Amino acid sequence: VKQIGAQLLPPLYSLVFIFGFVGNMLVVLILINYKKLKCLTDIYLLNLAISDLLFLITLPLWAHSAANEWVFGNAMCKLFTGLYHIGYFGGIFFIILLTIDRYLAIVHAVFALKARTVTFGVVTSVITWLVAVFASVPNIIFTKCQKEDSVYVCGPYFPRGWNNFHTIMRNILGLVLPLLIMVICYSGILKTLLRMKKYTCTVCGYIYNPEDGDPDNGVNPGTDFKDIPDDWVCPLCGVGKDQFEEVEEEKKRHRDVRVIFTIMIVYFLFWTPYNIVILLNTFQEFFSTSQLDQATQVTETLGMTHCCINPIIYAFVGEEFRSLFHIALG
Numbered sequence: 001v002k003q004i005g006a007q008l009l010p011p012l013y014s015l016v017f018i019f020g021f022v023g024n025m026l027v028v029l030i031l032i033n034y035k036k037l038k039c040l041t042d043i044y045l046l047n048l049a050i051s052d053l054l055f056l057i058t059l060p061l062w063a064h065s066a067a068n069e070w071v072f073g074n075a076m077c078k079l080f081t082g083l084y085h086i087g088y089f090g091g092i093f094f095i096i097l098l099t100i101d102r103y104l105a106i107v108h109a110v111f112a113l114k115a116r117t118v119t120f121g122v123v124t125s126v127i128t129w130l131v132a133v134f135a136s137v138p139n140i141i142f143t144k145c146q147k148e149d150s151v152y153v154c155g156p157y158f159p160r161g162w163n164n165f166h167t168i169m170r171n172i173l174g175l176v177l178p179l180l181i182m183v184i185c186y187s188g189i190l191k192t193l194l195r196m197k198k199y200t201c202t203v204c205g206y207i208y209n210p211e212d213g214d215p216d217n218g219v220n221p222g223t224d225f226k227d228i229p230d231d232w233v234c235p236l237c238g239v240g241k242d243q244f245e246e247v248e249e250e251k252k253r254h255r256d257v258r259v260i261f262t263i264m265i266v267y268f269l270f271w272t273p274y275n276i277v278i279l280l281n282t283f284q285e286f287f288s289t290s291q292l293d294q295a296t297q298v299t300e301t302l303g304m305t306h307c308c309i310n311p312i313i314y315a316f317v318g319e320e321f322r323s324l325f326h327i328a329l330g
């Protein structure tokens with residue numbers, strides 16, 4: 001495990017820092033220059049890129065210290081632990097705000113006034129950074145630079161009280177809160193999208209509008225396509241219900257749900273294994289102890305590579321890159 005750490009992490013963390021810094025800085029430049037931070041969602045996307053930047057700028061010191069002793073001092077050990085937790089806790093909170101922003105705008109039809117868009121986004125973002133700072137305060141206090149087995153190490157030294165409280169709070173803030181928000185928000189968004197979703201016929205091209213409906217053949221307005229009976233047929237050509245296909249939303253705010261939903265799902269796939277093993281390692285209910293100790297180190301690496309995956313999601317899943325690529329040519 002110690003030799004695997006000296007071999008695997010230095011080149012891995014170097015590649016994550018190169019791909020991560022260039023990618024996340026491009027997101028910041030595209031939000032400031034192309035989008036101009038006009039919408040409310042753009043301010044939280046900018047803070048999410050800053051959350052990743054603050055996190056990934058600590059990788060050169062972790063990459064270096066994976067193969068040799070800690071030589072930056074106790075002051076840098078405390079500072080770089082703060083940037084890790086502010087970047088980690090900060091990031092997950094801005095993903096929750098982007099999910100809440102979409103839930104209220106799609107499910108409840110709420111909108112920020114043009115004059116109060118920049119004012120609301122700035123005040124709530126400062127409050128989020130303050131809550132992310134207070135969540136990192138315990139980790140900055142107890143993480144120190146001490147010597148263990150004649151080797152200088154920058155690691156956590158929490159008493160049994162604050163260590164148990166650290167573990168449960170990291171799970172509540174990084175695993176229970178985002179997952180509890182995911183199930184309530186995205187289901188509610190899926191419910192309202194399904195009712196308003198339009199369906200196009202593959203034969204004649206007849207686009208079924210739910211707001212208008214089809215009063216002619218006994219379909220009152222505002223009815224869902226899934227709620228229409230099986231014996232129903234197309235008004236133009238009279239084809240069957242099985243030939244009708246789905247239509248993508250014309251509104252970019254409705255198509256943007258897939259971008260933020262992926263960001264949330266990818267966060268869980270990378271950070272849940274770490275959050276679960278620290279809970280199993282701290283609260284040894286039935287627990288073999290060496291397996292949980294090595295598993296905490298392996299799952300931490302996975303979580304630390306997550307910083308460079310956010311710009312890759314906006315490139316492939318998001319249409320904001322393909323639109324910018326067409327503008328860059330003609």
Ligand SMILES: CO[C@@H]1COCC[C@@H]1[NH2+][C@@H]1CC[C@@](C(=O)N2CCc3ncc(C(F)(F)F)cc3C2)(C(C)C)C1
Nearest residue numbers: 001004005008062065066081084154155297298300301
């Ligand atoms: C100062 O603490 C930091 C801020 O506060 C939270 C904890 C965080 N811990 C740091 C994060 C960098 C760190 C690390 O990433 N490690 C440990 C050693 C290790 N050894 C082998 C493998 C292996 F086998 F899986 F490859 C993985 C790993 C994972 C280390 C390189 C300095 C420990």
Ligand SMILES: [Zn+2]
Nearest residue numbers: 201204234237
């Ligand atoms: Zn038809």
